[PDB]
């Protein structure tokens, strides 16, 4: 069948009709190796990102774009581009930048290049509307968001499919963490613009709406001192 014609007839988005070896020990090694969760309330615009040490193997960047509040502080791509992400990224490291579905798909690539990365994946969060069957520049109804993966220095698929969240809910699918963690990229993981709701073992979460903080740079760095400095996050702990 033609699901595009079907969507124009019924309002059911084509992705509504997608139907969704273990690979579990990997998850268990990830959970064993995970640092305790750490988090810091910080107004990132006014905050010197350099206080965040050591340099991170993975950065997940989720600035709150205006377009996330259709029916409702937002960050413009101007603000985001001026973050000094290269000052806290490890020379070989990875980034995952949520770009929305509008100009962010162009401006977030400019950001990645500005910070020294090349894009290696374009992960798409495809939103179903099974339970409920508008940019002026838009030609089509926008039903997805993009998370760009960047690399700098020397199992899963690039699609996440979930139901469209309710209005005013800005959470991104928790599946992005599973994709990132399955890459086994290292254990210094930073989530910028995370929330109380996103705090997670193995991650340092930093954002303005956190209600509590437990971050200590020395305590945090001690999780990665020898003999644990180069673990992938998917190995056995060192005795």
């Amino acid at each position: 069948n033609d699901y595009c014609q079907h969507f124009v007839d019924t309002g059911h988005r084509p992705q509504n009709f997608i139907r969704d070896e273990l690979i579990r020990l990997k998850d268990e090694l990830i959970a064993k190796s995970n640092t305790p969760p750490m988090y810091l309330q910080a107004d990132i615009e006014a905050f010197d990102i350099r206080e965040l040490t050591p340099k991170f193997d993975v950065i997940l960047l989720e600035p709150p774009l205006e377009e996330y509040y259709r029916e409702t502080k937002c960050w413009t791509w101007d603000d985001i581009m001026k973050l000094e992400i290269d000052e806290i990224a490890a020379p070989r490291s990875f980034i995952f930048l949520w770009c929305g579905s509008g100009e962010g798909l162009d401006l977030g690539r400019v950001c990645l290049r500005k910070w020294g990365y090349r894009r290696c994946e374009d992960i798409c969060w495809i939103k179903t509307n099974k339970n409920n069957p508008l940019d002026p520049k838009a030609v089509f109804q926008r039903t997805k968001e993009h998370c760009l993966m960047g690399i700098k220095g020397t199992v899963d698929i690039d699609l996440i499919i979930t139901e469209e969240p309710e209005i005013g809910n800005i959470e991104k699918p928790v599946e992005i963490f599973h994709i990132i963690e399955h890459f086994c990229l290292g254990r210094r993981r930073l989530h910028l613009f995370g929330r109380d709701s996103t705090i997670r073992p193995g991650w340092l979460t930093v954002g303005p709406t956190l209600t509590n903080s437990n971050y200590n740079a020395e305590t945090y760095a001690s999780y990665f001192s020898a003999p644990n400095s180069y673990l992938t996050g998917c190995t056995e702990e060192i005795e």
Partner: protein, 198 residues
């Protein structure tokens, strides 16, 4: 003239000025990421002569996600949408760091298009993967609903791609099939002996 039309050619060397203006351009280029086009050849394609006001649909992959954006802006477009085609089998199941379940089509606008039905379709396509390098037929219906009855041109198309309202260019089409009289006239004026070399 509404029925299918095509021109077997090297798109590099064809003088596309004879073809007129189109409400929609679509291209599925052989990016250099087979029979290929270098980045400079892609940049140099005379896309700008093809439209005054309308939309470009540009299929991309790999580093052409970036290169295609460069071409698109160099040719005078602003990317305003990005279609995702999710590849399924006959049972509606999805077929370096990550496996790829999709292919991207950038949507660019040029000038001041008027009288298009923006917002009828959404930006995700779910459709059977068929022949290799073969895009899905649903894109033509989406394009027809967006710009009904207007003339359209496809670059790097192949025989199965020919459609009413569309002129198809590609080096794997069979000869030259033209029926729009204005096109036929400008073609004979420019190519009186029907050869295209430089």
């Amino acid at each position: 003239l509404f029925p299918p039309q095509w021109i077997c050619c090297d798109i590099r060397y064809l003088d596309v000025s004879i073809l007129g203006k189109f409400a929609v351009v679509m291209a599925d280029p052989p990016w250099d990421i087979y029979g290929t086009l270098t980045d400079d050849e892609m940049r140099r394609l005379n896309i700008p002569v093809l439209q005054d006001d309308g939309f470009l649909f540009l299929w991309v992959t790999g580093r052409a996600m970036e290169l295609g954006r460069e071409c698109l802006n160099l040719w005078g477009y602003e990317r305003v949408d990005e279609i995702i085609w999710v590849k399924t089998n006959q049972l509606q199941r999805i077929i370096h760091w990550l496996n790829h379940g999709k292919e991207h089509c950038l949507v660019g606008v040029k000038g001041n298009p008027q009288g298009f039905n923006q917002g009828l379709d959404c930006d995700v396509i779910v459709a059977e993967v068929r022949s290799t390098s073969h895009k899905p037929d649903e894109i033509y219906g989406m394009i027809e609903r967006l710009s009904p009855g207007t003339r359209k041109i496809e670059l790097f198309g192949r025989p199965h791609n020919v459609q009413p309202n569309w002129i198809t260019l590609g080096n794997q089409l069979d000869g030259i099939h033209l029926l729009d009289p204005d096109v036929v006239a400008r073609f004979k004026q420019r190519y009186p002996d029907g050869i295209i070399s430089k």
